């Protein structure tokens, strides 16, 4: 039991911002699956 002085954990500084469901779907493909990205099937989207 420690009230006066105990552990002080770090507080996260960044808060995630909501994004557009379509930009996130395409972006995750852009970074995770860099194979179909250099084709019209992905570029058209």
């Amino acid at each position: 039991r420690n009230y006066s002085g105990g552990q002080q954990q770090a507080i996260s500084r960044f808060t995630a911002r909501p994004g557009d469901p379509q930009v996130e779907e395409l972006y995750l493909i852009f970074t995770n699956f860099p194979a179909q990205t250099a084709y019209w099937e992905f570029h058209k989207k």
């Binding site: 084709y39 019209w40 099937e41 058209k44």
Partner: protein, 176 residues
Amino acid sequence: TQVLVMPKAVFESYKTAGVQFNKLLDTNYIVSETSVNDLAEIHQALTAFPFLLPEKLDIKLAVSPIIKVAELGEIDGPEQFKMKDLHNRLESRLATNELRDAGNRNLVYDYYLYPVDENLWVAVQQSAHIASSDPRRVSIQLNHTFFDSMINEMLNTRPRESVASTQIFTYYLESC
């Protein structure tokens, strides 16, 4: 390549009958495998194709079979006079169609692209839609899946940066 617009009825005949699509630009083959009416309808469908193709990328619209027949009828050879007789039949059948479908007037067609080699871009003229007010904009919105099909195929050989500067690429962006 070279775009060859044909009605759905003609395209389905070619696919069902099993006509070599590769040799539809060779006058001597298409006239043997194509009826007089089909040849006239191909001419009419070419003359009703509203879009300007990317000439800067060497993509041309096919010369109609009637013109090719007319030219061969004036060139010495062993089939010249048979080709002249074919020309006369095409003109009478074409005039007969023009007098019947003149009422069509204010409509635009959906097109479907069926690529055949790198020298032939079969463009199937499908169902008509009625469009009187700004039919240019209506045609563009209707043919979304035609524009992206053309883009997908020319990006196989042409540089992406060059295709991006075409009117076909623009039409895609305007549609969506």
